[PDB]
Amino acid sequence: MKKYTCKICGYIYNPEDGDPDNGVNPGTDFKDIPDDWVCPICGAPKSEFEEV
Ligand SMILES: [Zn+2]
């Protein structure tokens, strides 16, 4: 699985780390994150993300 980054702020979603505080377990491929999840830094939607 690949890392994704927020086009707005530069946050990196690392699938090996997930975002567990917001319910995204380690091992979650970006496509599988629930589509109401937002960037934990700037609040951007998934649609603003891209592969590193
Ligand atoms: Zn962001």
Numbering used by the authors: 1 to 52
Question: Paper's wording?
Answer:
Chimeric hybrids derived from the rubredoxins of Pyrococcus furiosus (Pf) and Clostridium pasteurianum (Cp) provide a robust system for the characterization of protein conformational stability and dynamics in a differential mode. A structure design algorithm was applied to the rubredoxins from Pyrococcus furiosus and the mesophilic bacterium Clostridium pasteurianum (Cp) to generate chimeric proteins in which the predicted hybridization interface can preserve each of the interactions in the parental structures. Interchange of the seven nonconserved residues in the metal binding site region between the Cp and Pf A2K rubredoxins yields two complementary hybrid proteins that are accurately represented as a sum of segments from the parental structures. These "cut-and-paste" models match the ultra-high resolution X-ray models to within the structural variability exhibited by the crystallographically nonequivalent molecules in the unit cell.
The coordinates for residues 1–6, 12–38 and 51–54 from Cp rubredoxin were combined with those of residues 7–11 and 39–50 from the Pf protein, to yield the metal binding site-swapped Cp hybrid. The metal binding site-swapped Cp rubredoxin crystallized in a P21 space group with three protein molecules per asymmetric unit, as earlier observed for a V44A variant of Cp rubredoxin. Refinement was extended to higher resolution with inclusion of heavy atom anisotropic temperature factors and all hydrogen atoms, to attain a final R (Rfree) factor of 11.2% (12.5%) for all reflections out to 0.79 Å. The rmsd values for the backbones of the A, B and C monomers with respect to the original search model were only 0.22 Å, 0.24 Å and 0.27 Å, respectively. Molecules A (green) and B (blue) are appreciably more similar to one another than is either of these structures to Molecule C (black). Molecule C diverges most notably from the other three molecules at residues Pro 45, Lys 46 and Ser 47, for which all backbone and sidechain heavy atoms differ by at least 0.5 Å from the superposition with any of the other molecules. Note that the direct interaction between the Lys 46 and Asp 35 sidechains that was predicted in the NMR analysis is indeed observed in the crystal structure. A clear difference between the NMR and X-ray structures occurs at the Glu 50 sidechain, for which the χ1 dihedral angle is 175° in the NMR-derived structure but near +60° in the X-ray structures, despite the fact that the 4.9 Å charge interaction with the Lys 7 sidechain is preserved in both cases. The metal binding site-swapped Cp rubredoxin analysis at 0.79 Å represents the highest resolution Zn2+-form protein structure reported to date. Given the marked similarity in Zn2+ and Fe2+ binding site geometries observed for Cp rubredoxin, the present structure may offer a useful model for the reduced active site as well.
